[PDB]
Design a protein around this motif. Structure first.
Motif, PDB file in Angstrom:
ATOM      1  N   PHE C   7      -2.455   6.236  -0.578  1.00 49.26           N
ATOM      2  CA  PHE C   7      -3.433   5.184  -1.541  1.00 49.26           C
ATOM      3  C   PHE C   7      -3.830   3.913  -0.442  1.00 49.26           C
ATOM      4  O   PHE C   7      -3.105   3.776   0.617  1.00 49.26           O
ATOM      5  CB  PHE C   7      -2.334   4.481  -2.411  1.00 49.26           C
ATOM      6  N   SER C   8      -4.972   3.572  -0.710  1.00 47.86           N
ATOM      7  CA  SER C   8      -5.288   2.326  -0.008  1.00 47.86           C
ATOM      8  C   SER C   8      -4.707   0.912  -0.535  1.00 47.86           C
ATOM      9  O   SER C   8      -4.344   1.049  -1.627  1.00 47.86           O
ATOM     10  CB  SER C   8      -7.024   2.524   0.004  1.00 47.86           C
ATOM     11  N   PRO C   9      -4.824   0.086   0.176  1.00 46.92           N
ATOM     12  CA  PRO C   9      -4.345  -1.357  -0.275  1.00 46.92           C
ATOM     13  C   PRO C   9      -4.981  -1.695  -1.512  1.00 46.92           C
ATOM     14  O   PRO C   9      -4.537  -2.673  -2.496  1.00 46.92           O
ATOM     15  CB  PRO C   9      -4.645  -2.373   0.896  1.00 46.92           C
ATOM     16  N   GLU C  10      -6.162  -1.313  -1.836  1.00 49.61           N
ATOM     17  CA  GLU C  10      -6.868  -1.508  -3.224  1.00 49.61           C
ATOM     18  C   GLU C  10      -6.294  -0.806  -4.359  1.00 49.61           C
ATOM     19  O   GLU C  10      -6.948  -1.020  -5.527  1.00 49.61           O
ATOM     20  CB  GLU C  10      -8.387  -1.462  -3.102  1.00 49.61           C
ATOM     21  N   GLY C  11      -5.667   0.073  -3.956  1.00 50.04           N
ATOM     22  CA  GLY C  11      -5.090   1.089  -5.207  1.00 50.04           C
ATOM     23  C   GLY C  11      -6.022   2.261  -5.293  1.00 50.04           C
ATOM     24  O   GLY C  11      -6.143   2.979  -6.435  1.00 50.04           O
ATOM     25  N   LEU C  13      -7.463   6.206  -3.655  1.00 47.09           N
ATOM     26  CA  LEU C  13      -6.898   7.453  -2.928  1.00 47.09           C
ATOM     27  C   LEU C  13      -8.181   7.512  -1.863  1.00 47.09           C
ATOM     28  O   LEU C  13      -9.430   7.923  -2.276  1.00 47.09           O
ATOM     29  CB  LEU C  13      -6.564   8.655  -3.627  1.00 47.09           C
TER      30      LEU C  13
ATOM     31  N   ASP I   4       2.980   1.724   5.914  1.00 46.90           N
ATOM     32  CA  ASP I   4       2.354   2.117   4.536  1.00 46.90           C
ATOM     33  C   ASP I   4       1.677   3.424   4.653  1.00 46.90           C
ATOM     34  O   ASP I   4       0.808   3.759   3.863  1.00 46.90           O
ATOM     35  CB  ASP I   4       1.478   1.042   4.277  1.00 46.90           C
ATOM     36  N   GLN I  18       3.307   2.003  -0.275  1.00 51.68           N
ATOM     37  CA  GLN I  18       2.539   3.238  -1.134  1.00 51.68           C
ATOM     38  C   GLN I  18       2.761   2.844  -2.603  1.00 51.68           C
ATOM     39  O   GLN I  18       1.868   2.817  -3.474  1.00 51.68           O
ATOM     40  CB  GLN I  18       2.871   4.566  -0.586  1.00 51.68           C
ATOM     41  N   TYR I  21       0.965  -0.118  -3.319  1.00 52.46           N
ATOM     42  CA  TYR I  21      -0.298  -0.043  -3.580  1.00 52.46           C
ATOM     43  C   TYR I  21      -0.926   0.892  -4.914  1.00 52.46           C
ATOM     44  O   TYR I  21      -1.790   0.726  -5.550  1.00 52.46           O
ATOM     45  CB  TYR I  21      -0.906   0.893  -2.423  1.00 52.46           C
ATOM     46  N   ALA I  22       0.253   1.796  -5.211  1.00 56.97           N
ATOM     47  CA  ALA I  22      -0.149   2.401  -6.556  1.00 56.97           C
ATOM     48  C   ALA I  22       0.031   1.353  -7.827  1.00 56.97           C
ATOM     49  O   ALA I  22      -0.803   1.443  -8.654  1.00 56.97           O
ATOM     50  CB  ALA I  22       0.942   3.498  -6.650  1.00 56.97           C
ATOM     51  N   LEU I  23       0.946   0.455  -7.641  1.00 58.48           N
ATOM     52  CA  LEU I  23       0.873  -0.927  -8.538  1.00 58.48           C
ATOM     53  C   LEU I  23      -0.270  -1.443  -8.603  1.00 58.48           C
ATOM     54  O   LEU I  23      -0.867  -1.911  -9.489  1.00 58.48           O
ATOM     55  CB  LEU I  23       1.915  -1.584  -8.197  1.00 58.48           C
ATOM     56  N   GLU I  24      -1.089  -1.473  -7.536  1.00 59.78           N
ATOM     57  CA  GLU I  24      -2.278  -2.215  -7.490  1.00 59.78           C
ATOM     58  C   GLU I  24      -3.455  -1.731  -8.267  1.00 59.78           C
ATOM     59  O   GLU I  24      -4.426  -2.286  -8.783  1.00 59.78           O
ATOM     60  CB  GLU I  24      -2.697  -2.392  -6.031  1.00 59.78           C
ATOM     61  N   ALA I  25      -3.342  -0.298  -8.224  1.00 60.87           N
ATOM     62  CA  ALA I  25      -4.354   0.600  -9.024  1.00 60.87           C
ATOM     63  C   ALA I  25      -4.285   0.093 -10.647  1.00 60.87           C
ATOM     64  O   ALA I  25      -5.320   0.295 -11.296  1.00 60.87           O
ATOM     65  CB  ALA I  25      -4.206   2.040  -8.921  1.00 60.87           C
ATOM     66  N   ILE I  26      -3.176  -0.264 -11.155  1.00 58.40           N
ATOM     67  CA  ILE I  26      -2.880  -0.733 -12.435  1.00 58.40           C
ATOM     68  C   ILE I  26      -3.638  -1.993 -12.775  1.00 58.40           C
ATOM     69  O   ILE I  26      -4.334  -2.249 -13.666  1.00 58.40           O
ATOM     70  CB  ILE I  26      -1.444  -0.726 -13.021  1.00 58.40           C
ATOM     71  N   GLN I  28      -6.332  -3.056 -11.348  1.00 58.15           N
ATOM     72  CA  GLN I  28      -7.551  -2.971 -11.522  1.00 58.15           C
ATOM     73  C   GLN I  28      -8.201  -2.164 -12.754  1.00 58.15           C
ATOM     74  O   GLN I  28      -9.295  -2.476 -13.301  1.00 58.15           O
ATOM     75  CB  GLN I  28      -8.292  -1.781 -10.430  1.00 58.15           C
ATOM     76  N   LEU I  74      -5.091   5.323 -12.889  1.00 55.36           N
ATOM     77  CA  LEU I  74      -5.686   6.443 -12.658  1.00 55.36           C
ATOM     78  C   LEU I  74      -5.442   7.244 -14.120  1.00 55.36           C
ATOM     79  O   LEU I  74      -4.183   7.708 -14.205  1.00 55.36           O
ATOM     80  CB  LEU I  74      -4.890   7.097 -11.427  1.00 55.36           C
TER      81      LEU I  74
END
Ligand SMILES: [Cl-]
Ligand SMILES: [Mg+2]
Lengths: 244, 250, 235, 243, 111, 229, 240, 241, 231
Positions: C7-11, C13, I4, I18, I21-26, I28, I74
């Motif tokens: 994952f990137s820092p922005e979330g 892949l 990271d 990591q 960063y997965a938490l960050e996707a939520i 968004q 995702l």
């Protein structure tokens, strides 16, 4: 995890070259020179042992010339240990073929098989390639006397005369100059030894620094004989050809 | 878990060098000196028992090892690597030869098997090369007496006489002056003791020197009588007393 | 280096985002859905005049009721098409019926995120999947290497996509005929293509309930190009 | 440098930095404790109320293994659950082969070896939890505490999490003032007090107290949660001591 | 020697009308000359307006019905709650049965 | 595939107005040898279920351990393990029936016949049977082995259909069960005088009776019987 | 097993390992394919840096996949053998199951599929090979010529070239090859193929190989003298 | 510089990860000593319980591997228990396969071989422990064999391990230089334990209470550890002369 | 930073980047709300479109007759995790004739996500889930994070601008918990909650997605004109 320590042995460079293959070829360029010359009535294999000692037991020593079967032999340039792994595999392949078809394996088929094994180590598995170049000298009833070479890339080619190892550029130029198509084995023996004598990094070419072999139909009638020369026999042929 | 190191740890550098093999050879160079000399009627292998502590019982640490009744081995370099190679060498002599042909392998072929194991640690995934050079002495019916050196790369060479490790360069020069093709076994032992004294700093006696021979058959060491064709092992390790006796005639 | 599934820092892949850049370099593909059918059109983009253009196959049949157009690294599409065809045929074997267009699309998209250290990387190609079923009628889907699929009334993918999509924004309405959609795809393809559009460097196709999926002949498309030229000169 | 980028790598000190970084995650977690009493053990934990929307008494943290062992942990909660799942498999296989329920020292080593195994390779990450656990077996009561390194010892009292220093000091007073020992009911009261006292390190948000116990006389050597009147009595005793 | 099969008796009957269908069966379950149950349901509502009975060896019968009911559930999950038509159910059951071609469900199935 | 060695005979049961009753003797036979005389074949699971097992005893002891492990596992991360999320008779039965059918499908059966007796959360009576073949069925009366041939006919006179269940008291049901056990002792060569009986009632809960004996036996008429003709 | 993802995307959406495989193709000796009205000709460059070569036994550049289809290539020689072997096995497998020899397009599609697979499989690198596949479909007299490359894309060509200096010979073919009237005879087709290589080759001696494939499994390789006669006639017309 | 992270050779032919594993060995700050009597083998080790909340009965670095073999460990407890469990498994398997009790020296070799593998295989790290095995072998008599993270092992007349091993080693060396024999010439194991404690006191320059020490004793057919009260009786006898 | 590159590496302060960063996707992802009373449990989700020609991405997935969730992040990861829940619900019904408890479903999701945070080669899930259900202990609402942390709540919200809806539910706590036997009023409270997270856009007929489960109510999803009543 483990990715950190992976050298990635099977990748292209930006120029489309295989790093490890190129570096393995660099290793082989420091190995003792091996020469093969094909004549109408046989093949010659001549090779230089690397800076030896007086306490080395020569008559029981083998680092360059190996028998694959009664009809096919190889000259080695590179890592000897790597070569023995491949040599044993080639010996097994020849016997597998003989068991299957009840005929001796044609020279090219054996060469292609070993070359394909080398190729695999450059495309998959993540392992280092074999740091070995071979000269194959052999006979079969289809093409007769044949010379081949293979290198760590797994590419192979056929030759009338060829060298591998150190000083191949100089050696190949000398062979290209004096080689003729109607040449005979006794002439080819002389050419091989003369070429080694001029290209060698040693001060002088002596019997204890050489390995020598011939494949002749000089076997009584319709058959082929392999002759791995003994230390005394290498000493005699050096005197006969006027090098010592 | 799982071994995820499926890639080679030894690779060619731009100059064509295999770094890990070179570095393994450097480890061998730091190792204690060991040597081997071949005579007409035997072979001798010798080394120093460099005891790590005087409280340690150095007799319990065997640097010279029997591989088969007619084959012995000594090393220079990393001791633990040597020990496991001796275990593997002993086993492969049975699995890839004795269980097939009903007899022990000839020296050159056992050397070939040990060499193959060392070669594979130089190409296989997730392993380093062995940090030892071996000297293997032996006898067999059709090849007679022989002496071989095996290096970390897996390369092996036959010798009339040689030395490996710490003071090998000086020792090999010493052996070149003394060796001839008419030496008897006792002469070779004498030369071995002379050569080894140069590389030893401290005590030089039967308790600090380890020496073994490949010579005549020893029916007294067979352990049974009744079979004429079985005449006993040719490998024999010399005792502390036997070494000291030959140090008076030194 | 770094993980393939990182994952990137922005979330996002990294690998999925990078594959989207490869799709932007691909040749243009356009789809328009109507109540009379769905049209699919592509830019062939031959690299040389000696290349026989009818061997360029960027529009493909999945089943009689489902077609597909591609844009990006088109070699990557072959295993996706194979899976789609197998999924369509397998469902017919198991259930004695046609598979729903959405279900087919979902099956293709399940392959997308099956990469790591399974395949070594994401697909570098985007698909426009068009078809018809009895439950939801004429449908057009956009399948991405992220595993996400959106249904569209009209959609453009490839190098001329954002210019084409803006054009589709203005032109699409819920009463379009099949003929009107055909001309509309041709018009927008002609707009975004580098070379001049003709029957040899562009290809049309459609899916109807009656006739199923059909790739248009070069002679048939040539007439529609001539019809387009005349109606644009008409004002 | 770079020795701290990969698990199982020895630094020039002879340290595994990745394991030491796992300890930081433990120190960031909520306070959990364990008290060894006369014929059993008591476990207690601080549960931070992040919001009013959390349903009271529902998000249970203490976990039972078999029927006689309690487990509580501080740090990454999922890691603790993974460790307890393994512990439950270990306890099941022991009882399957040997019939008798797994002894506490035996169980301690099973967890210890498993946690230690996650410090042997770079393909895995160390556990981000310190686990306090124990119960009653044939030889009596046992209390253990297990660290990310795999290290564990037996304890008279144990504490981990953000308020561990405060808790330890309180536990040390109990050991000194009661050489003869502490009763199970006393230990529940004392456990409530210590968590309330340790909550000063987490004073921003309010919390929920959760207690469990295994005692030979009070619970027949089975692990049970402290509920209702006995829990309220312990809360009252705790609130009285802080004022 | 262990016999994995048995016979639980029972008789079932399916008739198709112009705009209806019936599936009937007796409620008696037996082994040999004994009665196990006087009321053990044998015909089941499997959802989507489909009824099913798998008569013969009751253990296999219950297993097949249970698996088909499950297949209906997953057809809804996988295909946007689409109704499973009787023809589609029939083809699906063929695959459930032929999946054990070399160790069959010892039943006669009717839907 | 195997053969049963040490075996248990009949298990009998019936429903009554407020619950179920189940019973089984305390014998472990070794062929015709009445080897073991203290074998408990009724195994309670919680306070709402009793599993009665006949057939191979080694396989019974295995099932006994599966059930013990089921209770342990249900209590894991379950605050309502002694309340709303406790094990029901229907859960325990379906689990066993799944195991039995899976084992016969691998051609390695658990050589048993099982009856699960209990009362559900809503007070409903539960009574269902499963055997080594994975065959299942339910009835107002259930019995295994010899009990199927001799007990069911007697118990069916009390509860012949579903509508007879509310009309049947616990005293009448227990009486019928106890009489059937006497009849089986008269006529089953692999039976014993000693037996266990369990009652699961929706009001009074689980009553487990051990060390019961067959009593009030008729033998006196034997003295007048002479010869064979 | 070794699972490392060697072929991956870069920030700009490129797979460098696949692109570097094309650079290996650029280094390889030049290969050219031209289809006439009733034939296809495959021409190949032989670098004269290697003399003292035994031409009887040295691997030839054009390989028969079946009696009716041939394959030539540019790039890594060792890599090409693996593709040739796989293609030959598939050709026999097709005859065994379908009871009909492969079409030229099918064989191309298979080889191209293998190449693609090696661009998104773990632990492997792409083939450093582009191929020209030519022949005639069974019972068909229409000439076929296809090209593949490391990425796995393939297409049909009226005439095409690959390898070193292929940009130059493609330039020649694009101005000299007319689609409305392709080389009507074998002579005309061979002449145009030799002409195209003479733009790049050096000496017209043992540096040019020519293989003619006609319908119904009629495949023959021209000898040195036969090719030498084309080389002679071309330059004598050029002296004007 | 990844040659320092995994067990591959440095340009000097060194294995840094092995060297750093030797350093982890002294992390506990505990010293151990082993000596041989006529009929016995004694091992003593310092015991430090720094926390009052600890149960002191569970704090131990001496392990009963088999009935005959004992093992003391110098290094962190997780790696110590890892080695202990493996040694116990190996000893039990040996007896099952070969029909007799695994000798002390053979177990040492086996554990040394396992350690060697960790120095050659990259995915496995060395254990940061030194293992001292003790027994009264049925063939060799009183035995001390010690293993380290390099995979090295050897027999000992006596040995010492820990931060202050050199002081203890020299003290022992000087005693055996006087007596000119390879063991403590004493009949009872009690007096051999007294010798071991006395010479550790002399070498370290520190006094010991009953809770400061940990003692293991190997006799014919059994290895056992002493209780605090057994150690106290030993300390009283030392003080009374 | 240097820590990271993969999920198998702690930072010097004990963080797993990591996972973060997965938490960050939520964050968004589009907003979704969950809340419950004692009789019913409700999910409300704001669906997101690509453009005006595109459909609105579905947010709610049914897992069983008595359980289902809403997603944020995702979408393919939600499909994987919801598929797993469907299987686990199904295993419980087939083997034990038992409806899977919502609390136990949360424990299973936690453990599945955890394995992806401690091993090399894998990656954390990039989605957050709100699980509602009605079982033997009444109505339930769970919040799932791909760190593995699962929490039982009266109400909550996840996604972009979810803080507004979460504060509203924190105020209304005492009111909406008492909405028993009135499904429409509970949904109204959820629609009013999600409205506190909207900016520039409002709730339209193809924008809004609602789900409900309760005492005598199977898990059902409402889309299209079925939610016009609540707009
Ligand atoms: Cl071993
Ligand atoms: Mg290692």
């Amino acid at each position: 995890g483990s990715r950190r320590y992976d050298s990635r042995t099977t990748i292209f460079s930006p120029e489309g070259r295989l790093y490890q293959v190129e570096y393995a070829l660099e290793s082989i360029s420091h190995a003792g020179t091996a020469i093969g010359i094909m004549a109408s009535d046989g093949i010659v294999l001549a090779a230089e042992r690397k800076v030896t000692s007086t306490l080395l037991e020569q008559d029981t020593s083998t680092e360059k010339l190996y028998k694959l079967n009664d009809k096919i032999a190889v000259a080695v340039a590179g890592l000897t240990a790597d070569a023995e792994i491949l040599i044993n595999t080639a010996r097994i392949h020849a016997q597998n073929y003989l068991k299957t078809y009840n005929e001796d394996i044609p020279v090219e088929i054996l060469v292609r098989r070993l070359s394909d094994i080398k190729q695999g180590y450059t495309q998959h598995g993540g392992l280092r390639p074999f740091g070995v170049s071979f000269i194959y000298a052999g006979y079969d009833d289809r093409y007769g006397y044949q010379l081949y070479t293979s290198n760590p890339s797994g590419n192979y080619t056929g030759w009338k005369a060829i060298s591998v190892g150190a000083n191949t550029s100089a050696a190949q130029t000398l062979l290209q100059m004096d080689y003729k198509d109607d040449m005979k084995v006794d002439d080819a023996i002389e050419l091989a030894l003369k070429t080694l004598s001029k290209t060698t990094d040693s001060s002088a070419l002596t019997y204890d620094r050489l390995e020598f072999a011939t494949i002749r139909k000089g076997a009584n009638d319709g058959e082929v004989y392999q002759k791995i020369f003994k230390p005394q026999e290498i000493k005699d042929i050096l005197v006969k050809t006027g090098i010592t | 878990m799982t071994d995820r190191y499926s890639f080679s740890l030894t690779t060619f550098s731009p100059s064509g060098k295999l770094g890990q093999i070179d570095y393994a050879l450097t480890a061998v160079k730091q190792g204690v000196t060991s040597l081997g000399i071949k005579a007409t009627n035997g072979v001798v292998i010798a080394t120093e028992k460099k005891s790590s502590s005087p409280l340690a019982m150095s007799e319990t640490l065997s640097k010279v090892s029997l591989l088969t009744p007619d084959i012995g081995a000594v090393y220079s370099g990393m001791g633990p690597d040597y020990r496991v190679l001796v275990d593997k060498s002993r086993k492969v002599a049975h699995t890839s030869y004795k269980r097939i042909y009903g007899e022990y392998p000839p020296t050159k072929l056992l050397v070939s098997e040990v060499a193959k194991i060392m070669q594979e640690a130089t190409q296989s995934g997730g392993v380093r090369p062995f940090g030892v050079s071996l000297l293997i002495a032996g006898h067999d019916e059709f090849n007679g007496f022989s002496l071989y050196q095996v290096d970390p790369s897996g390369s092996y060479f036959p010798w009339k006489a040689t030395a490996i490790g710490k003071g090998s360069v000086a020792a090999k020069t010493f052996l070149e002056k003394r060796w001839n093709d008419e030496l008897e076994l006792e002469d070779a032992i004498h030369i071995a003791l002379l050569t080894l004294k140069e590389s030893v700093e401290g005590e030089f006696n039967g308790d600090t020197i380890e020496l073994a021979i490949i010579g005549d058959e020893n029916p007294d060491l067979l352990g049974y009588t009744g079979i004429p064709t079985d005449k006993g092992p040719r490998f024999r390790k010399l005792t502390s007393q036997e070494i000291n006796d030959r140090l008076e005639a030194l | 280096d770094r993980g393939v599934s990182t994952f990137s820092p922005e979330g996002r892949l990294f690998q999925v985002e990078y594959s989207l850049e490869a799709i932007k370099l691909g040749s243009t593909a356009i789809g328009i859905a109507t109540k009379e059918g769905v049209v699919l059109g592509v830019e062939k983009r031959a690299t040389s005049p000696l290349l026989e253009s009818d061997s360029i196959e960027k529009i493909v049949e999945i089943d009689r009721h489902i077609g597909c157009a591609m844009s990006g690294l088109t070699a990557d599409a072959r295993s996706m098409i194979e899976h789609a065809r197998t999924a369509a045929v397998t469902h017919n074997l198991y259930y004695d019926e046609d598979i729903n267009v959405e279900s087919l699309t979902q099956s293709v998209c399940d392959l997308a995120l099956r990469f790591g250290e399974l395949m070594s990387r994401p697909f570098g190609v985007a698909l426009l999947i068009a078809g018809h079923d009895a439950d939801d009628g004429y449908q057009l889907f956009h399948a991405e290497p992220s595993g996400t699929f959106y249904r569209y009334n009209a959609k453009a993918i490839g190098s001329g996509s954002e210019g084409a999509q803006a054009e589709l924004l203005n032109e699409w309405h819920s009463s379009l005929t099949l003929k009107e959609a055909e001309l509309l795809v041709l018009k927008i393809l002609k707009q975004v293509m580098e070379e001049k559009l003709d029957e040899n460097n562009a290809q049309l196709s459609c899916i109807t309930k009656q006739d199923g999926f059909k790739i248009y002949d070069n002679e048939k498309t040539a007439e529609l190009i001539k019809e387009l030229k005349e109606k644009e000169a008409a004002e | 440098t770079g020795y701290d980028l990969s698990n199982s790598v020895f630094s020039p000190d002879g340290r595994n930095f990745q394991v030491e970084y796992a300890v930081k995650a433990v120190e960031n977690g909520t306070t959990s404790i364990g008290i060894k009493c006369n014929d059993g053990v008591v476990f207690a934990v601080e549960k931070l109320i992040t919001s009013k929307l959390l349903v009271p008494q529902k998000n249970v943290k203490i976990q039972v293994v078999d029927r006689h062992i309690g487990c509580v942990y501080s740090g990454l909660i999922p890691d603790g659950r993974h460790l307890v799942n393994r512990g439950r498999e270990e306890a099941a296989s022991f009882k399957k082969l040997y019939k008798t329920p797994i002894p506490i020292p035996a169980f301690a080593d099973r967890l210890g070896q498993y946690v230690q195994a996650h410090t042997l390779y770079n393909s895995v990450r160390p556990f981000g939890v310190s686990t306090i656990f124990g119960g009653v077996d044939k030889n009596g009561a046992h209390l253990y505490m297990l660290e990310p390194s795999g290290s564990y010892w037996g304890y008279k009292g144990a504490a981990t999490g953000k308020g561990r220093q405060s808790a330890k000091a309180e536990l040390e007073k109990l050991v000194d003032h009661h050489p003869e020992g502490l009763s199970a009911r006393e230990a529940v009261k004392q456990a409530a007090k210590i968590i309330y006292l340790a909550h000063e390190d987490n004073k921003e948000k309010d919390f929920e107290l959760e207690i469990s116990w295994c005692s030979l006389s009070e619970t027949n050597g089975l692990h049970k949660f402290v509920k209702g009147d006995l829990l309220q009595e312990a809360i009252d005793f705790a609130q009285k001591e802080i004022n | 020697q262990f016999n994995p099969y048995g016979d639980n008796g029972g008789t079932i009957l399916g008739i198709a009308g112009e705009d209806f269908a019936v599936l009937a069966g007796d409620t008696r379950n037996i082994t040999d000359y004994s009665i196990n149950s006087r009321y053990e349901p044998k015909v089941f509502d499997c959802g989507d307006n489909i009824v099913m009975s798998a008569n013969g060896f009751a253990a296999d019968g219950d297993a097949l019905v249970k698996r088909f009911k499950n297949s209906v559930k997953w057809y809804h999950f996988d295909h946007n709650d689409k109704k499973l038509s009787i023809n589609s159910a029939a083809r699906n059951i063929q695959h459930l049965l032929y999946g054990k071609r070399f160790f069959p469900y010892y039943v006669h199935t009717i839907i | 595939t195997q053969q049963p060695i040490v075996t248990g005979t009949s298990v009998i049961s019936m429903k009554y107005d407020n619950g179920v009753i189940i019973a089984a003797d305390n014998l472990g036979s070794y062929g015709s040898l009445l080897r073991f005389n203290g074998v408990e074949r009724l195994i309670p699971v919680g306070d709402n279920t009793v599993v009665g097992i006949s057939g191979d005893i080694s396989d019974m002891q295995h099932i006994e351990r599966l059930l013990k492990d089921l209770v342990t596992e249900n209590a894991y991360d379950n605050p309502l393990a002694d309340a709303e999320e406790a094990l029901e008779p229907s859960y325990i039965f379906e689990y066993l029936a799944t195991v039995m059918y899976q084992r016969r499908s691998k051609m390695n059966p658990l050589w048993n016949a099982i009856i699960v007796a209990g009362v559900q959360s809503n007070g409903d009576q539960f009574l269902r049977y499963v055997n080594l073949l994975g065959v299942t069925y339910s009835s107002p009366t259930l019995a295994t082995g010899f009990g199927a041939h001799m007990a069911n006919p007697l118990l069916r006179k009390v509860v012949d259909r579903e509508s007879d269940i509310p009309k049947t008291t616990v005293q009448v049901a227990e009486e019928a069960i106890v009489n059937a056990m006497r009849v089986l002792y008269y006529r089953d060569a692999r039976s014993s005088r000693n037996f266990s009986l369990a009652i699961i009632d929706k009001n009074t809960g689980l009553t487990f009776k051990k060390n019961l004996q067959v009593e009030n036996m008729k033998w006196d008429f034997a003295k007048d019987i002479k010869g064979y003709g | 097993g070794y699972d490392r993802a060697l072929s991956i995307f870069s920030p700009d959406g490129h797979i460098f390992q696949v692109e570097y495989a094309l650079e290996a193709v650029k280094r390889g000796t030049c290969a050219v394919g031209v289809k006439g009205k009733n034939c296809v000709v495959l021409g190949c460059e032989r670098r004269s840096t290697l003399k003292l070569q035994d031409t009887r036994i040295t691997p030839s550049k054009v390989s028969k996949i079946d009696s009716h289809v041939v394959l030539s290539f540019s790039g890594l020689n060792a890599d090409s053998r693996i593709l040739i072997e796989k293609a030959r096995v598939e050709a026999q497998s097709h005859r065994l199951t379908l009871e009909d020899p492969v079409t030229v397009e099918y064989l191309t599609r298979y080889v191209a599929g293998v190449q693609q697979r090696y661009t998104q499989s773990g632990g492997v690198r792409p083939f450093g090979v582009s191929t020209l596949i030519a022949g005639f479909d069974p019972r068909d007299d229409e000439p076929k010529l296809y090209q593949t490359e490391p990425s796995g894309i393939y297409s049909s060509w009226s005439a095409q070239t690959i390898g070193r200096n292929s940009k130059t010979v493609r330039e020649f073919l694009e101005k000299n090859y007319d689609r409305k009237e392709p080389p009507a005879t074998v002579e005309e087709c061979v002449k145009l193929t030799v002409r195209s290589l003479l733009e790049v080759v050096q000496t017209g001696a043992k540096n040019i190989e020519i293989t003619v494939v006609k319908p119904d499994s009629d495949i023959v390789a021209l000898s040195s003298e036969e090719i030498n006669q084309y080389v002679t006639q071309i330059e004598q017309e050029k002296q004007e | 510089g990844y040659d320092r992270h995994i067990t591959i050779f440095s340009p000097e032919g060194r294995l840094y990860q092995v060297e750093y594993a030797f350093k982890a060995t002294n992390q506990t700050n505990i010293n151990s000593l082993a000596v041989r009597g006529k009929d016995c083998t004694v091992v003593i080790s310092q015991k430090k319980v720094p926390d009052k909340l600890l149960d002191p009965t569970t704090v131990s670095y001496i392990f009963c591997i088999s009935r005959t073999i004992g093992m003391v460990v110098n290094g962190p407890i997780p790696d110590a228990r890892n080695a202990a469990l493996r040694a116990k498994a190996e000893a039990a398997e040996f007896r099952y396969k070969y029909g007799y009790d695994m000798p002390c020296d053979v177990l040492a070799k086996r554990m040394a071989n396992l350690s060697q593998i960790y120095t050659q295989r990259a995915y496995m790290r060395p254990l940061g422990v030194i293992l001292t095995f003790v027994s009264v072998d049925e063939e060799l008599g009183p035995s001390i064999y010690k293993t380290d993270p390099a995979g090295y092992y050897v027999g000992y007349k006596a040995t010492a391990t820990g931060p202050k091993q050199q002081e203890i080693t020299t003290n022992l060396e000087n005693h055996f230089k006087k007596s000119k024999i390879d063991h403590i010439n004493e009949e009872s194991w009690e007096k051999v334990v007294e010798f071991a404690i006395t010479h550790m006191i002399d070498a370290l320059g520190t006094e010991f209470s009953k809770n400061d020490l940990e003692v293991g004793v190997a006799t014919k057919d059994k290895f056992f550890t002493l209780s605090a009260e057994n150690i106290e009786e030993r300390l009283v006898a030392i003080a009374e002369q | 930073n240097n820590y990271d590159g993969d999920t198998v590496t702690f930072s010097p302060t004990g963080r797993l980047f990591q996972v973060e960063y997965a938490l960050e996707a939520i964050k968004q992802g589009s907003v979704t709300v969950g809340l419950r009373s004692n009789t019913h449990a409700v999910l409300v989700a704001l669906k997101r479109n690509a453009d005006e020609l595109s459909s609105y991405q579905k947010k709610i997935i049914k897992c069983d007759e008595h359980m289902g969730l809403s997603l944020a992040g995702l979408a393919p990861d939600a499909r994987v995790l919801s598929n797993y829940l469907r299987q686990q619900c199904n295993y419980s019904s087939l083997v034990f004739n038992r409806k899977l408890a919502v609390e136990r479903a949360g424990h299973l999701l936690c453990d599945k996500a955890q394995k992806n945070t401690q091993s090399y080669g894998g990656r954390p899930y990039g989605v957050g889930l709100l699980i509602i259900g009605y079982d033997k202990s009444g109505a339930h609402l769970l919040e799932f994070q791909p760190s593995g942390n699962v929490t039982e709540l009266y109400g909550t919200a996840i996604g972009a601008r979810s803080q507004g809806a979460k504060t509203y539910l924190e105020r209304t706590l005492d009111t909406f918990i008492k909405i028993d036997g009135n499904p429409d009023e509970l949904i109204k409270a959820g629609v009013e909650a999600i409205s506190q997270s909207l900016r520039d856009e409002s709730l339209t007929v193809d924008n809004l997605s609602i789900a409900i489960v309760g005492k005598d109510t199977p898990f059902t999803i409402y889309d299209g004109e079925a939610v016009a009543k609540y707009i």
